[PDB]
């Protein structure tokens, strides 16, 4: 999830926008 | 530079990036 | 939660939401 | 600049995307 994308990870704008809403 | 966004600093960067969208929580 | 971008914290906004495009500095 | 309006005071993303490049 959010959490292994872009805190584990590094995540892009569009992965995060995806999470949005 | 941390690039990760973990904890309150990933809530801030969908705050800015979601703007009238909102987001979960 | 800080919704203010500071320091390293405002390069890693720049990072994220600028991404290809690059910027300064 | 960016300082103020970003750091000081608080951006949106339209903001932020105007200091890319």
Same mark, same amino acid.
């Not at chain 1, 959010?2 to 990870?9: A, L, N, P, R």
């Not at chain 1, 704008?13 to 809403?21: A, I, T, V």
């Given at each position: 999830?959010?959490? &292994? =994308?872009?805190?584990? @990870?590094? %995540? @892009?704008?569009?992965? $995060? &926008? !995806?999470?949005? !809403? | #530079? !941390? =690039? *990760?966004? %973990?904890? @309150? *600093? $990933? #809530? &801030?960067?969908?705050? $800015?990036? %979601?703007? &009238?969208?909102?987001?979960?929580?």
């Amino acid at each position: 999830g959010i959490v &292994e =994308q872009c805190c584990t @990870s590094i %995540c @892009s704008l569009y992965q $995060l &926008e !995806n999470y949005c !809403n | #530079v !941390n =690039q *990760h966004l %973990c904890g @309150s *600093h $990933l #809530v &801030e960067a969908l705050y $800015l990036v %979601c703007g &009238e969208r909102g987001f979960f929580a």
